[PDB]
Structures are given as structure tokens and as C-alpha cells.
Amino acid sequence: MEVAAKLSGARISAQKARLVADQIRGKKVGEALNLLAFSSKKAAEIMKKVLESAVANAEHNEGADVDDLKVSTVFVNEGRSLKRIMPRAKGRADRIVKRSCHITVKVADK
């Protein structure tokens, strides 16, 4: 089966988002939703909607059952970043990078 759901340009750093990605890798979608619902991380709130969107795609486009699915693949890739200017002391100027990421979640009933 192995149906997917992607979120492009999520406004969070990839290194921050990968801490939550490997907390749900390989788990059943039933207990993966409980972990994300009660986590204190911001990336867990973002990644929860990608996981529920994948489940909805499974039920509608493929006629699956939520009790049968499990998180088969999850990864976080880097996106494009905004560049800003930070004034420092004595006329010095710094460059600020605001990073983003792509999140892909796949659920499979096998």
C-alpha cells in the first residue's frame, strides 16, 4: 500500500524536526497519534497534521482501516531559507538564516 503525505516549507529547522520524526518511526498510527498529542515540542504539533492527512488519504483513496496502518517511513528534508540582517555592536552586521523543512510521512497497512 504505502500511501504518503507531504508538507513543504514547514517553518521550522530540520534538525529540530528530526527529534520528533524518529520518535514515531515504525510505530502503529494508533499509538503514534497519542505520542504526538501529548508531546511538548512544537514540531510534534506540525508533524501531527501530516500524519493525520496521510491516514485520511489511506481511508479515502485506498479504502483502508486506521487500525491496520503503521508508520512505515518518515523523514525530514531541508527547504529554502530566508536571509535577514542582524545589527551588532560597533557597526557590525550579521546575517540571519531562517530555515525551513519538508516533512514526509508514509503509512502502510502491510
Partner 1 sequence: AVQQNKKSRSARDMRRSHDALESNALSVEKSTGEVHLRHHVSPDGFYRGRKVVDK
Partner RNA sequence: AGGGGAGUGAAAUAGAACCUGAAACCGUAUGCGUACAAGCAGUGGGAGCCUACUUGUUAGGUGACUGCGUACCUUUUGUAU
Partner RNA sequence: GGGGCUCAAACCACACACCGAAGCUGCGGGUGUCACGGUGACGCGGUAGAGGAGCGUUCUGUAAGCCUGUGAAGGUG
Footprint of RNA (CB under 7 A) = 3-9, 14-15, 18, 22, 25, 49, 53, 56-57, 60-61, 73, 75-78, 80
In whole angstroms, what is the distance from residue 54 CA to residue 77 CA? Answer: 18
The entry of RNA, partner 1, none near residue 78 (CB within 5 to 8 angstroms by kind) is RNA
C-beta atoms surrounding 11 within 10 Å: 12
Cα angle at 27 between 37 and 79, to 5 degrees?
70
The entry of RNA, partner 1, none near residue 61 (CB within 5 to 8 angstroms by kind) is RNA
Q: What are the backbone angles phi and psi of residue 97, rounded to the nearest 5°?
A: -110, 120
Residue with smaller CB distance to RNA, 39 or 100: 100
Residue with smaller CB distance to partner 1, 8 or 77: 77
Q: How far is CA 34 from the centre of its chain?
A: 15
Residue with smaller CB distance to partner 1, 31 or 62: 31
Q: Are 100 and 81 in contact (CB under 8 A)?
A: yes
The entry of partner 1, RNA, none near residue 25 (CB within 5 to 8 angstroms by kind) is RNA
